[PDB]
Design an enzyme around this catalytic site. Structure first.
Site, mmCIF file in Angstrom:
data_model
loop_
_atom_site.group_PDB
_atom_site.id
_atom_site.type_symbol
_atom_site.label_atom_id
_atom_site.label_comp_id
_atom_site.label_asym_id
_atom_site.label_seq_id
_atom_site.Cartn_x
_atom_site.Cartn_y
_atom_site.Cartn_z
ATOM 1 N N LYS A 6 57.123 27.296 -69.596
ATOM 2 C CA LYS A 6 57.609 27.227 -67.879
ATOM 3 C C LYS A 6 56.770 27.559 -66.930
ATOM 4 O O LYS A 6 56.731 26.626 -65.325
ATOM 5 C CB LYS A 6 59.202 27.735 -67.489
ATOM 6 C CG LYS A 6 60.147 28.033 -68.830
ATOM 7 C CD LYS A 6 61.434 28.438 -68.044
ATOM 8 C CE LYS A 6 62.541 29.226 -68.434
ATOM 9 N NZ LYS A 6 63.426 29.408 -67.775
ATOM 10 N N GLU A 26 59.280 33.557 -58.864
ATOM 11 C CA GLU A 26 59.984 32.040 -57.822
ATOM 12 C C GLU A 26 60.591 32.880 -57.245
ATOM 13 O O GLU A 26 61.425 34.087 -57.408
ATOM 14 C CB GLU A 26 61.294 31.664 -58.856
ATOM 15 C CG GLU A 26 59.974 30.839 -59.634
ATOM 16 C CD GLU A 26 61.161 29.580 -60.250
ATOM 17 O OE1 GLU A 26 62.609 30.272 -60.925
ATOM 18 O OE2 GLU A 26 61.128 28.405 -61.028
ATOM 19 N N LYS A 74 75.258 30.458 -68.880
ATOM 20 C CA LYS A 74 76.414 29.081 -69.224
ATOM 21 C C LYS A 74 78.245 29.426 -69.825
ATOM 22 O O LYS A 74 77.503 29.938 -71.233
ATOM 23 C CB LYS A 74 76.122 27.808 -70.018
ATOM 24 C CG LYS A 74 75.395 27.270 -68.843
ATOM 25 C CD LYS A 74 74.128 26.322 -69.910
ATOM 26 C CE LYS A 74 73.079 26.085 -68.756
ATOM 27 N NZ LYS A 74 71.989 24.007 -69.583
#
Ligand SMILES: Nc1ncnc2c1ncn2[C@@H]1O[C@@H]2COP(=O)(O)O[C@H]3[C@@H](O)[C@H](n4cnc5c(N)ncnc54)O[C@@H]3COP(=O)(O)O[C@H]2[C@H]1O
Ligand SMILES: Nc1ncnc2c1ncn2[C@@H]1O[C@H](COP(=O)(O)OP(=O)(O)O)[C@@H](O)[C@H]1O
Ligand SMILES: [Mg+2]
Ligand SMILES: [Mn+2]
Lengths: 404, 81, 654, 163
Positions: free
Chosen positions: A122, A201, A238
């Site tokens: 990533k 992030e 999810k």
């Protein structure tokens, strides 16, 4: 087009619903199929749906049996298979696996090694997104030590998202949680994923999770099959997925789709993949590429009419998206109503979503207009074990209107 | 109520009744040689007639029904070798 | 859309009622349908739509076999309950790569193998574990399924072996008749697992592996197919050491590019001057004649284990001076003297000896392979074998032997009375069964005694299958009917002698050494036809085309050459094998304990029915029998519940 | 007076060799209780020697007749049979006398190590050398066995014991 791309027999290096999904596509393409199963999974439906099947990972724990690269290759070579479809999860993003499959002379149904390398990591994936001029999330230059991480929080502020290169993630709202968060995530990284690299992030508040389906062939054609909204999540996992993203304007959705295509064209993406974005007030940010089919591919198939898995296999055979596979040009890709997918699992919502185990006494599955079922291991008499995921059956519905 | 001998599951030497009904006519007897497809006996289910044919060449071992006898599904009709 | 329909139709699993699915499947395959051009009269005018394949079902035959054995036992043994068995141990080998006799045969031919043998200083070994050892100890019941689990280890771990004896003798018919597995399948399977090991068979010169009178072309065809299917070494013998019965077989083996051992059967005692009929000159004269046939190797077959060590030494030393062919010695350890006899033979220059793995050695088997290695280790001449590998491999055989407990003859120990009666092992156990079935078990010692007297009455004969059966039938008959030797000469005209005895005295087994005793022959044969030449000359002519077409009709497919020859050898047995295949399927693939005992309640087994197809079978319930003997078992087969009806014979026979 | 066991399958040849060396007395069992871990057979050694320079002193025909009784009687003891009576040459490696072998098999069973008995035979041999290379007969053979079992049970090598 690699040498040896012609196929008569395919092996799935997976189990459960995704293996059955691949076998169905193979049978429809006139390919014969091969299953692998761990001992503890010997009553899985996928074992019996294949034309032939083989036990793997003898004497290993059941999950390790499905991660047993050499034994899987052994079966592929012994059965005379041409090709391995890795499904999702397990080894499907594993560079070592794909390398050894291809080194054993077999077709790996998936993208190039180089793509598994840059999109499996990533950090590397973000670098490729910058290079393709796709907006990302402000994050650390590369991987960081605790001091470079703390630096980032001074530069951009809290809250912040700590993520493993191989996810695997923790939210940090302050310094104490940054010290704690970085530790716990570097644990589960060397732990469940084998390596310990880590990046940070900015944490976006209340985003939507929008992702775009890509197909690329070996002749430089790339198309998108619109997007999916996967925002309905519990603890960042999810739960329900819909397609298209009916709560966003068509223009904004098209913009997201084009950005995905831009990234994939830049790197020469081959086969099926998905580009994932976070979306917040009419901006969008790249987070990830999953260089493989996804559990929710089903709802994209329903709104486009395109069989994604048959496409993956035909792509791996060296076929052209348009001339041979028969997909139209981008602007002619259908967009037919909407579709919703739920995964029915044995997770007990009244017991902290711990997966239940035991014998299934009764299993009666609905049908009718606008219903699609992709069953895992659920049939009357099946014993749900504690060794594997808790999926019983994937249900999709589809109709002209979202409300229906 | 003495049960009737059932045909063994998967045993092609034993022909079991497929539906409840009765035996109309027996055409062979213990010891007779017989050829594939040859008619061995006739039965009825809801007064529709079925002819039981030999599954292959062989010698009849025995009958386990008699003329006009009533039969239920799985009942052993005849054994072949 | 059509492909999806086709996929869905084939994927449906519906059991308990018939459906129209096979009909639907045919409709959508047809090009009138797939082109979109069908009309309302299409189906009604297309008869090919109403042809349906037989839906194939190996699962159901398996459940039938498992239910039969579970409930009713395995025929001819005690219907007991199935032990839990561990997996047999696998050997840890230290591999050494070497050229083997088989490699030499394939690359350079038979005469080059012979030179390799003549130039070897060590004594070479032939392993009998796959044939004679279990023929003696386990009534020839050893199964392919057990052999194939260790075969590759023998090939790689014991490359020093001259050959493995793995075929012939009783294995051919026992495989078909009692194991419901083909001896040819056994040979093919093993041939692939053991590409560097010579395969040896025992071959009766006159009739290969059978017991009727076959014509020459049959014997020659047997040899052709056997050689083609992977037999390297043919050990050709005749039950009366009658060379005319061996000649053609020897030549055909040579013609097929393989190794022919011509055999002398040993009997009597060369060191007993009161028994000059089978003295050393007898054996040297026969050896010279066998050498002249062009046989590659001379075999000495001591089928009863009579050879004592000082006689072995004298026999072998004399033969080595008489002929130049290598000598291959075969004895049994019945007396407990087998190792010392092989050691003596080794000192006399023997080239090759027959040994069994330790765990299948001793008693009426061959002497132990591992033992003779250590007997010779410190001597002037060693045995050629990797002994440490052989010890590891023996673990597997020791574990596998336990499966065959129901077939053990009794406790494996020395028995020296063999010197007195001279029965080979099988003649001993059989003759014990036969005396049992006729209620004379309690006088078996009088029978051993009569066997010996009969042997002398018949002129002192070579006793190996089937001449040994001749002597046995007669001894039994004489005890049963209370006759002495006087009685047979006095009252023989009014007695009906057993079949095998009459056939012997009619010359149907060939001509014996020294001829028949004349008076007794007349008494026995009466008004039947007597021949004095080779029985094969009188054999009904056999046309392979005729036989092949007859067989094809009988079994419903085109038989391979191996099947045709099986049918000729053993017609009714081959046909009965076919019926058992049709009823129970390929029982060869079951593990031995399941093959013999079926399953226990709640047991799970895995049957490997093809590469990539395994049946997972679990026995969930064993129903009680109703009054007609119907029992219902409930299995789980690969995730489905299956209900199986079997008839309980013990209720039937009550 | 020489006493051996036929465990290796070399017992008769060893007695015959001893005879030619002038041994005075040898220990033999009746055929039906001979071989394996028993003594070599009485009737067998008679016949091995019969045609040699020195014979065995025994009425061999009476011994054969007596052996019929023992054969019949042995069947009564099926539940106690150690297993199939056959040669086992690994004895040269581990040097356990018969009883030390069966006992040590029980002991490894009753502590759930039956499945590693081949590692135990191997350890028995290593223990013997560790102890200086000793004579192993009851009870010194048990000393070696207990130690080998202990060492496998607790996962120790020879290094480990010294450390
Ligand atoms: N001087 C010595 N040094 C070391 N070891 C010695 C020995 N003399 C005998 N042995 C050992 O005893 C074994 C049995 O010899 P034995 O004379 O009892 O019994 C002999 C005898 O019955 C017979 N045999 C051997 N040579 C013979 C001959 N020239 N004549 C007659 N019979 C013979 O074969 C048996 C096996 O003899 P083989 O030589 O293979 O095996 C010999 C050898 O392993
Ligand atoms: N920077 C971020 N800010 C806020 N939420 C995030 C961020 N990164 C990931 N998430 C949450 O975690 C989910 C999974 O993100 P992803 O990077 O795909 O992890 P995974 O590898 O588990 O799919 C996202 O849908 C989102 O809800
Ligand atoms: Mg993700
Ligand atoms: Mn023999």
């Amino acid at each position: 087009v690699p040498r040896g791309s012609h196929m008569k027999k395919l092996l799935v290096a997976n189990r459960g619903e995704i293996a059955v999904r691949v076998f169905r596509a193979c049978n429809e393409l006139g390919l014969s199929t091969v299953a692998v199963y761990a001992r503890e999974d010997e009553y899985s439906v996928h074992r019996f749906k294949a034309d032939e099947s083989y036990l793997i990972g003898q004497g290993k724990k059941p999950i390790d049996a499905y991660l047993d690269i050499d034994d899987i290759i052994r079966v592929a070579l012994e059965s005379g298979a041409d090709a391995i479809h890795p499904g999702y999860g397990l080894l499907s993003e594993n560079l070592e696996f794909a390398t050894k499959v291809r080194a054993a002379g077999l077709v790996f149904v998936g993208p190039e090694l180089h793509h598994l390398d840059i999109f499996g990591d990533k950090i590397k994936a973000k670098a490729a997104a910058d290079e393709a001029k796709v907006p990302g999330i402000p994050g650390t230059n590369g991987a960081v030590d605790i001091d470079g991480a703390l630096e980032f929080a001074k530069t951009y502020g809290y809250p912040v998202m700590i993520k493993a290169a191989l996810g695997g993630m923790r939210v940090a709202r302050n310094d104490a949680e940054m010290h704690d968060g970085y530790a716990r995530a570097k644990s589960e990284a060397i732990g469940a994923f084998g390596s310990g690299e880590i990046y940070v992030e900015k944490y976006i508040e209340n985003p939507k999770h929008i992702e775009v389906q890509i197909l690329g062939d070996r002749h430089g054609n790339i198309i998108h099959l619109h997007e999916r909204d996967c925002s309905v999540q519990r603890r960042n996992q999810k739960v329900i997925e819909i397609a298209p993203a009916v709560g966003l304007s068509p223009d904004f959705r098209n913009e997201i789709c084009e950005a995905a295509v831009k990234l994939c064209k830049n790197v020469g993406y081959v086969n099926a993949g998905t580009v994932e974005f976070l979306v917040k007030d009419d901006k969008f940010y790249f987070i990830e590429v999953n260089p493989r089919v996804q559990v929710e591919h089903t709802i994209t198939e329903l709104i486009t009419g395109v069989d994604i898995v048959q496409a993956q296999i035909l792509i791996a055979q060296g076929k052209d998206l348009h001339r041979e596979i028969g997909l139209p040009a981008q602007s002619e890709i259908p967009l037919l109503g909407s579709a919703i997918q739920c995964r029915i699992t044995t997770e007990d919502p009244q017991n902290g979503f711990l997966p239940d185990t035991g014998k299934i006494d009764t299993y009666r599955s609905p049908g009718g207009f606008g219903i699609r079922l992709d069953v895992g291991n659920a049939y009357a008499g099946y014993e749900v074990t504690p060794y594997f995921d808790s999926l019983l059956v994937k249900v999709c519905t589809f109709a002209n209107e979202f409300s229906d | 109520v003495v049960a009737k001998r059932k045909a063994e599951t998967g045993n092609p030497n034993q022909i079991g009744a497929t539906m409840p009904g009765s035996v109309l006519e027996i055409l062979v007897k213990a010891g007779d040689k017989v050829q594939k497809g040859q008619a061995l006996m006739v039965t009825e289910a809801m007064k529709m007639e079925t002819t039981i044919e030999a599954p292959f060449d062989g010698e009849i071992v025995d009958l386990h029904v008699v003329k006009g006898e009533a039969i239920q599904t799985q009942d052993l009709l005849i054994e072949i070798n | 859309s059509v492909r999806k329909m086709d996929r869905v139709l084939h994927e449906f699993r519906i059991r308990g009622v018939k459906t129209n699915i096979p009909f639907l499947i045919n409709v959508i395959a047809n090009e009138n349908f797939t082109s979109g051009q069908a009309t309302t009269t299409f189906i009604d005018n297309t008869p090919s739509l109403f042809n349906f394949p037989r839906l194939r079902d190996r699962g159901t035959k398996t459940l039938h076999y498992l239910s039969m054995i579970t409930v009713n036992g395995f025929p001819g043994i005690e219907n007991t309950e199935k032990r839990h068995f561990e997996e047999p141990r696998q050997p840890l080998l230290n591999l050494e790569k070497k050229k083997t006799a088989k490699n030499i045969l394939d690359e350079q031919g038979a005469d080059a193998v012979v030179d390799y043998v003549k130039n070897t200083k060590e004594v070479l070994l032939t392993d009998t574990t796959l044939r004679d050892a279990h023929q003696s100890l386990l009534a020839t019941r050893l199964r392919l399924q057990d052999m194939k689990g260790i075969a590759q280890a023998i090939d790689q771990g014991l490359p020093e072996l001259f050959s493995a004896e793995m075929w012939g003798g009783a294995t051919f018919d026992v495989a078909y008749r009692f194991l419901n597995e083909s001896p040819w399948y056994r040979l093919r399977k093993l041939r692939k697992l053991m590409p560097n090991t010579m395969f040896q068979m025992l071959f009766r010169g006159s009739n290969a592996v059978g017991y009727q009178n076959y014509p020459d072309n049959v014997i020659e065809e047997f040899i052709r197919v056997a050689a083609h299917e992977g037999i390297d070494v043919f050990r050709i013998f005749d039950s009366l050491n009658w060379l005319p019965q061996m000649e053609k077989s020897i030549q055909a083996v040579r013609d097929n590019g393989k190794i022919a051992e011509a055999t002398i059967c040993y009997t009597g005692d060369i060191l007993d001057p009161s028994r000059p009929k089978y003295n050393i000159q007898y054996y040297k004269d026969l050896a010279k004649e066998l050498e002249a046939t062009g046989a590659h190797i001379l075999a000495v077959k001591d089928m009863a284990g009579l050879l004592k060590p000082q006689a072995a030494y004298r026999l072998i030393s004399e033969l080595k001076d008489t002929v130049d062919l290598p000598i291959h010695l075969h004895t049994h350890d019945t007396s407990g003297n087998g190792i010392i006899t092989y050691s003596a033979a080794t000192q006399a220059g023997v080239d090759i000896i027959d040994v069994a793995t330790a765990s299948l050695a001793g008693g009426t088997s061959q002497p132990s392979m591992q033992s003779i290695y250590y007997a010779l280790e410190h001597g002037p001449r060693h045995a050629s074998i990797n002994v440490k590998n052989a010890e590891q491999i023996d673990h597997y055989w020791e574990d596998v032997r336990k499966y065959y407990a129901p077939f053990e003859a009794g406790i494996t120990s020395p028995q020296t009375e063999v010197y007195m009666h001279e029965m080979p092992g099988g003649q001993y156990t059989n003759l014990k069964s036969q005396a049992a079935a006729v209620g004379l078990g309690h006088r078996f010692d009088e029978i051993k005694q009569m066997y010996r007297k009969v042997n002398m009455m018949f002129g002192d004969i070579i006793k190996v299958t089937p001449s040994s059966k001749v002597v046995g039938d007669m001894a039994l008959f004489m005890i049963q009917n209370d006759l002495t030797e006087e009685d047979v000469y006095a009252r023989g005209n009014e007695l009906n002698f057993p079949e095998s005895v009459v056939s012997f005295f009619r010359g149907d087994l060939g001509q014996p050494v020294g001829g028949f005793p004349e008076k007794l022959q007349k008494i026995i044969v009466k008004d039947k036809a007597v021949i004095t030449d080779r029985p094969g000359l009188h054999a009904e002519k056999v046309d392979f085309e005729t036989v092949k077409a007859d067989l094809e009709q009988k079994i419903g497919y085109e038989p391979g050459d191996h099947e045709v020859i099986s049918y000729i050898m053993y017609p009714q047995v081959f046909l009965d094998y076919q019926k058992m295949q049709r009823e129970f399927g390929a029982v060869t693939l079951l593990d031995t304990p399941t093959f013999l005992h079926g399953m226990r309640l709640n047991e799970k087994i895995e049957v490997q029915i093809e590469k990539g197809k395994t049946l997972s079978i679990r026995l969930d319930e064993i129903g009680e029998p109703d009054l007609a003997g119907n029992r219902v078992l409930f299995f789980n087969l690969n995730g489905q519940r299956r209900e199986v009806v079997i008839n309980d014979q013990s209720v039937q026979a009550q």
